[PDB]
Structure 1
Amino acid sequence: IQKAIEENNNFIKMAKEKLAQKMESNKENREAHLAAMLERLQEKDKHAEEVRKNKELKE
C-alpha cells in the first residue's frame, strides 16, 4: 500500500512539473516571437527617420 501511495504521488508530481515546464517554455517562446516582431518594426521606424533625414540634407 505504501508503494501504491508512492507511485500515485510520483505520478501527480511528475505531471505537475511536466506541465509547469511546458507552460513556462511556451510563455518564453511566445514572448520572444512577439519581441522579435516588434524589434523588426522599430528597425523600420528607425529606417524611416534616416529617410526623412536624408531628405533634409538634400535641401
Structure 2
Amino acid sequence: KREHEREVIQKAIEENNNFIKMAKEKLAQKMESNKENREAHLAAMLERLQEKDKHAEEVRKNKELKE
C-alpha cells in the first residue's frame, strides 16, 4: 500500500510535467513555423518588387539603345 501511494503521487507529477512539457514545445514549434511563414511571405513580396526594379532598368536601357 505505501508502494502504491508513492506510485500515485509520482504518476501525478509525471503527467503534470508532461503537460507543461508538451505545452512548451507545441508553442515553440508554432512560433517558429509562424516566423518562417511570415518571413517567406514578405521575402516573396520583396522579390516581386525587385523584379519591377530590374524590369525598369531594362526599359531605360531599351530607350537609350534606340540610338
Tell me the TM-score range normalised by the shorter chain. over 0.9
Shift of 1:30: 0.2
Q: Which runs of 5+ in 2 are unaligned?
A: 1-8
Q: Tell me how far apart the structure 1 counterparts of residues 18 and 33 of structure 2 sit (CA, whole Å).
A: 22
Shift of 1:40: 0.2
Shift of 1:18: 0.2
State the number of aligned residues.
59
Q: Tell me how far apart the structure 1 counterparts of residues 27 and 33 of structure 2 sit (CA, whole Å).
A: 10
Shift of 1:17: 0.1
Name which one, 1 or 2, has greater alpha-carbon Rg: 2
Q: Which runs of 5+ in 1 are unaligned?
A: none
Shift of 1:20: 0.1
Partner secondary structure for residue 65 of structure 2: helix
Q: Tell me how far apart the structure 2 counterparts of residues 57 and 27 of structure 1 sit (CA, whole Å).
A: 45
1:16 aligns with 2:19: no
RMSD: 0.4
Shift of 1:14: 0.3
| Consecutive aligned runs of 4 or more in structure 1 exceeding 3 Å deviation | none
Q: Tell me how far apart the structure 2 counterparts of residues 36 and 11 of structure 1 sit (CA, whole Å).
A: 37
Shift of 1:21: 0.2
Q: Tell me how far apart the structure 1 counterparts of residues 41 and 30 of structure 2 sit (CA, whole Å).
A: 16
Identity of aligned residues (%): 100
